[PDB]
Amino acid sequence: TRFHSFSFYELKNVTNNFDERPISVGGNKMGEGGFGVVYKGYVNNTTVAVKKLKQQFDQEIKVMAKCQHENLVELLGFSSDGDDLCLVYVYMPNGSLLDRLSCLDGTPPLSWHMRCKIAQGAANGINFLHENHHIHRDIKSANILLDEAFTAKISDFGLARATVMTSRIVGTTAYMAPEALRGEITPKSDIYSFGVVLLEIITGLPAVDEHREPQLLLDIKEEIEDEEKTIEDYIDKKMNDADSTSVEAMYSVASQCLHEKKNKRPDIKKVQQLLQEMT
């Protein structure tokens, strides 16, 4: 396939022997993604992301061959020869939306203007996936990466599938649709999850917080409906460009996305339209 074949020993070499120490401390580890660890490598004149993990390996190189879009992380290549399997991706220097919202490591808070762009970018990514009959199954802010220009790139396609039910229920609890928690498999569940993402974008809050009432961000939608609070009271304080009307428009998209009944939710195409209007 169109992907560059890598020697395991080159990948081992360019990652400082798969240095397990985190980046912030001088090592090469960038994260752990269930099916293995992700390392920074310096190959040629290029920083890359190497996942060091067989069945669910050849699935990815299948999906990734077909699924290339401006708002999806691109696979560059792979390693099959001896010791461990490796997947190599384009490196995203601004990390995840999760971390930028939490301003992890002292990064500056994001403007409302950039947040609108990232939201649109991510809706474009999902639309492509759905257009080509793929369900992501794990849409969340930690799986939205950001490149040099803060362009949104959807990653972690491990659980991606090319309405039926399953026994192996997967996804992240705080972002999962009611039906998806019942083993149902459907794009309508990606929308529910994107809805939680928009709530994170508006409020800068984590999807779950055990010391918080409510623990689940999605439960604020009911506090607003029961007008015991308003969206205004929830808006991230760490912005200076957030006009009330556009924020309200995004909250409306989130609200619709979070319809607990799967058929009443808008599809990704409508979500896309609504986010352009907002802008």
UniProtKB/Swiss-Prot annotation:
Domain Protein kinase residue range list: 24-275
GO biological process: cytokine-mediated signaling pathway; innate immune response; interleukin-1-mediated signaling pathway; interleukin-33-mediated signaling pathway; intracellular signal transduction; JNK cascade; lipopolysaccharide-mediated signaling pathway; MyD88-dependent toll-like receptor signaling pathway
Enzyme's top EC category: transferase
Molecular function GO labels: ATP binding; interleukin-1 receptor binding; kinase activity; magnesium ion binding; protein kinase binding; protein serine kinase activity; protein serine/threonine kinase activity
Localization per record: Cytoplasm
Cofactors: Mg(2+)
PTM comment, free text: Phosphorylated.
Residues at the active site: D138 (proton acceptor)
GO (cellular component) term, any one: cytosol
Catalytic activity: L-seryl-[protein] + ATP = O-phospho-L-seryl-[protein] + ADP + H(+); L-threonyl-[protein] + ATP = O-phospho-L-threonyl-[protein] + ADP + H(+)
Location (main, coarse): cytoplasm
EC number: 2.7.11.1
Chain positions found as Phosphoserine: S167
Residues that, per the record, bind ATP: 30-38, 51, 140-143, 156
PTM sites of type Phosphothreonine: T163, T166
Keywords from the UniProt entry: Acetylation, ATP-binding, Cytoplasm, Disease variant, Immunity, Innate immunity, Kinase, Magnesium, Nucleotide-binding, Phosphoprotein, Serine/threonine-protein kinase, Transferase
Recorded superkingdom: Eukaryota
Function: Serine/threonine-protein kinase that plays a critical role in initiating innate immune response against foreign pathogens. Involved in Toll-like receptor (TLR) and IL-1R signaling pathways. Is rapidly recruited by MYD88 to the receptor-signaling complex upon TLR activation to form the Myddosome together with IRAK2. Phosphorylates initially IRAK1, thus stimulating the kinase activity and intensive autophosphorylation of IRAK1. Phosphorylates E3 ubiquitin ligases Pellino proteins (PELI1, PELI2 and PELI3) to promote pellino-mediated polyubiquitination of IRAK1.
Family: Belongs to the protein kinase superfamily. TKL Ser/Thr protein kinase family. Pelle subfamily.
Involvement in disorder: Immunodeficiency 67: An autosomal recessive primary immunodeficiency characterized by recurrent, life-threatening systemic and invasive bacterial infections beginning in infancy or early childhood.
Subunit structure of this chain's protein: Associates with MYD88 and IRAK2 to form a ternary complex called the Myddosome. Once phosphorylated, IRAK4 dissociates from the receptor complex and then associates with the TNF receptor-associated factor 6 (TRAF6), IRAK1, and PELI1; this intermediate complex is required for subsequent NF-kappa-B activation. Direct binding of SMAD6 to PELI1 prevents complex formation and hence negatively regulates IL1R-TLR signaling and eventually NF-kappa-B-mediated gene expression. Interacts with IL1RL1. Interacts (when phosphorylated) with IRAK1. May interact (when phosphorylated) with IRAK3.
Protein name (Swiss-Prot/TrEMBL): Interleukin-1 receptor-associated kinase 4
